[PDB]
Every structure is written in structure tokens, then in C-alpha cells.
Design a protein around this nucleic acid. Structure first.
Ligand code: UDP
Length: 351
DNA sequence: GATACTAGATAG
DNA sequence: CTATCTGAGTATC
């Protein structure tokens, strides 16, 4: 049994980019299950073998981390072109890891064929004919199917909480008490404005000391429907392996999601925040039944409630420490079901 | 004539 | 909002 995992549209090297990081963590967690897996990317490297140096059909299973098909600058995107070229030659079922609602599987040929540099490729090279099974991080398979309505070779849909890989890694450990220099923190990208309303509501004009780290930029928030005057402090992106330690600099860390994530997706930040030294404050809309933690104190309905909850936490170390103890305990209860999670993943990829 | 990383705008 | 069209600014093993 030999498994290959690739990221469909991003180079994989280290933890400097989120797409590369996710691919490496998945490679790592699968390896820790006792499976023989290789990451195939553009070049040979510490964690990867090159697309041009292996035979895709030497693998019994081909796992593909989702990505968009974006030819930046209208120019060829080697990551996506090489990945689909690799996928097109595979003669078995492909397992598409659907971890981001914005990234459903799609064919690149229909996009490439109308490009001026189309002559560089052919339908035979890029058209993926293998059947695809979508492993949805979201429990709602109707949303997953709707996202893939345009493609016809996707024949299977199954839910699996992929993002738990963070807490099941062999070397996982909760964050220790950390010096507090921030009231609230949130790390991520602009996500093409798919979450602008929520970001503005909970992170802007709060009067609190807030930091927004990641690839998001102040200039990106310009939708006239979600006005603001004061912004949080935007800082640069950091390696994914350091996210919980970064979150730990704040009294609290925010949990929000895209509309289609509400009561559907559990995201990496839920675990990264839960494991940090920052109290997890969740947007009520994201988890209306409080399935994450059965304690209303961890939930906020709007900006005013977030402000009040944060001040309560700063005013009472006893309360803050109690809540951290609780979220840490809840996380451990899920970590206790590691074997169950590993087995379910194996079955998801027909093993 | 560097190279790597990262969808935004417009139409229907 | 979904389908379709257009195609660059910032950061650097
Ligand atoms: O500087 C940063 C900011 C974010 N992240 C990662 O990016 C994820 C968030 O991704 P995204 O912006 O797509 O938001 P989501 O939809 O996951 O909430 C976080 O959970 C981290 O794992 C990271 O590695 N570095």
C-alpha cells in the first residue's frame, strides 16, 4: 500500500504558506497512522518528491488537497498545471480533501483552452477522467454537492473532520500560560471578502487592543456595506506550526466562519484557539447549538458582547483561568478519540 | 532577463 | 448571488 498526497494548486515546501503547511501536516498525520505516503510537488525536497520523477500509477491511493484554479496575472500557474497533469494520468479513484468551501474541484482545461498560451497544453494532458470522491470537512453534504454541481466525475461525497489533524499529531501539546499583550487576536487571510461583515463586526471599531495577523491587509476592507473607522493592528503572516503560540499572546481569540461554515464546518482555528492560552470566543451564529463547548460564556452574539466578555476576562483572572481549563479539557476529550478518528480516515480513503 | 507567493471585478 | 471574464502588487532561502 503506497499513498500519494498532493496539493492541487500550491507549491509544497515548508510551513511558510498555509497551503503547503496543511499538505505537510496531512502527510505527517497519515504517516503516523502507519501508512506509506509521499507528498508529490513541483520539486524534490525535504518533504517532497517531484511530479516528474515518480509514476502516479505506482500509488494505490491519490489524495488531493483542494485548491482554486487561478492563473495570476493571466500567466500560467505551474502548481495547478503540473498537479492536474499528474492527476490526469492516474487510473484510479481520486480522493479530494474539501477543507475550504471556496475550493471545490474543477477542471483546468476549460480555463486553459481559452488562454493565449493554450498551445502549451492539450486536453489529453489536463483533462481528469478518474472518478472523484469528495471528503467534505463540512458535515452538510448537500452544500458540498452543490459546490461541485458543475463537475460530473465526482461520484462520492463523505463527511470527515479533516481539521482535527492538528490535535492528533503525535507531538501535540497545549500552550502554557503566556504574557498577555493583546485583548483579542485573529489570524487568517481576507478570504476574498467572504467573511468581511463578521471581521468588521468583531475586530474593527471595538476600542480594544486587537491584532489581526496573517495575509489580510487593511486596504482590502472597502465594502461600503460594512463601514469602519478604526481597524485592528494588522501584522504579517507566521508559519502555521506557530499559530497556537501566536494566539496565546491575547486574552481571547475570535472564532468566526463563512456563512456556509455555520453549524457545518469545524475549522483549524477552533482547535488552534482551543489549544492556545487565549480564551476561545465563538460567534453564536457559527455554532448555534454550542456543540463545540457546552458553556454559553464562550459565545458572543455581536461586537458589544465581545467587548463585555473580554473586559470580564481581563477583570477576573479566576474566570479567565477557569475558562482556559475548560476549553483545554474539552480538547483533550476529543484527543482521547484519536484511534476512532484514524480509523474513520482510513475508511474514508477506502483502507 | 528573478523568483515566490496570493483572486478581484464585472455580467446576468 | 452565481456564472463568467480579466489578469498584478507585495515579499524575498
Ligand atoms: O499568519 C497566519 C494566519 C493564519 N494561518 C493559518 O490559516 C488558518 C486560517 O485560514 P483562513 O484564513 O482560510 O480562515 P478559516 O476559513 O480557516 O477560518 C489558520 O487557522 C491557520 O492555520 C497561518 O498559518 N498563519
Amino acid at each position: 500500500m503506497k499513498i500519494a498526497i498532493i496539493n492541487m494548486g500550491n507549491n509544497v515546501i515548508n510551513f511558510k504558506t498555509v497551503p503547503s503547511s496543511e499538505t505537510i501536516y496531512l502527510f505527517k498525520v497519515i504517516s503516523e497512522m502507519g501508512l506509506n505516503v509521499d507528498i508529490i510537488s513541483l520539486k524534490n525536497g525535504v518533504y517532497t518528491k517531484s511530479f516528474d520523477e515518480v509514476d502516479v500509477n505506482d500509488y494505490d491511493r491519490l489524495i488531493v488537497v483542494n485548491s482554486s484554479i487561478n492563473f495570476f496575472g493571466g500567466k500560467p500557474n505551474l502548481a495547478i498545471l503540473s498537479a492536474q497533469k499528474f492527476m490526469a494520468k492516474y487510473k484510479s479513484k481520486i480522493y479530494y480533501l474539501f477543507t475550504d468551501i471556496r475550493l471545490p474541484f474543477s477542471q483546468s482545461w476549460p480555463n486553459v483552452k481559452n488562454r493565449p498560451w493554450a498551445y502549451l497544453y492539450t486536453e489529453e494532458e489536463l483533462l481528469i477522467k478518474s472518478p472523484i470522491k469528495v471528503i467534505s470537512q463540512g458535515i452538510n453534504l448537500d452544500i458540498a454537492k452543490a459546490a461541485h454541481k458543475k463537475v460530473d466525475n465526482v461520484i462520492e461525497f463523505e463527511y470527515f473532520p479533516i481539521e482535527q489533524y492538528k490535535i492528533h499529531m503525535n507531538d501535540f501539546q497545549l500552550s502554557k500560560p503566556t504574557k498577555k499583550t493583546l485583548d483579542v487576536i485573529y489570524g487568517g487571510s481576507f478570504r476574498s471578502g467572504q467573511r468581511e461583515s463578521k471581521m468588521v463586526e468583531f475586530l474593527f471599531d471595538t476600542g480594544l487592543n486587537i491584532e489581526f495577523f496573517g495575509n489580510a491587509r487593511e486596504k482590502q476592507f472597502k465594502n461600503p456595506k460594512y463601514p469602519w473607522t478604526k481597524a485592528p493592528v494588522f501584522t504579517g503572516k507566521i508559519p502555521m506550526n506557530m499559530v497556537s503560540e501566536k494566539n496565546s499572546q491575547a486574552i481571547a481569540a475570535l472564532i468566526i466562519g463563512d456563512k456556509n461554515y455555520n453549524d457545518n464546518f469545524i475549522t483549524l482555528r477552533v482547535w488552534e484557539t482551543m489549544a492556545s492560552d487565549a480564551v476561545m470566543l465563538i460567534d453564536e451564529e457559527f455554532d448555534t447549538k454550542h456543540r463545540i463547548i457546552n458553556d454559553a460564556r464562550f459565545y458572543v452574539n455581536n461586537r458589544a458582547e465581545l467587548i463585555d466578555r473580554v473586559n470580564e476576562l481581563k477583570h477576573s483572572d479566576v474566570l479567565r483561568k477557569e475558562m482556559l481549563s475548560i476549553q483545554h479539557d474539552i480538547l483533550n476529550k476529543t484527543r482521547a478519540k484519536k484511534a476512532e478518528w484514524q480509523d474513520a480516515f482510513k475508511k474514508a480513503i477506502d483502507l
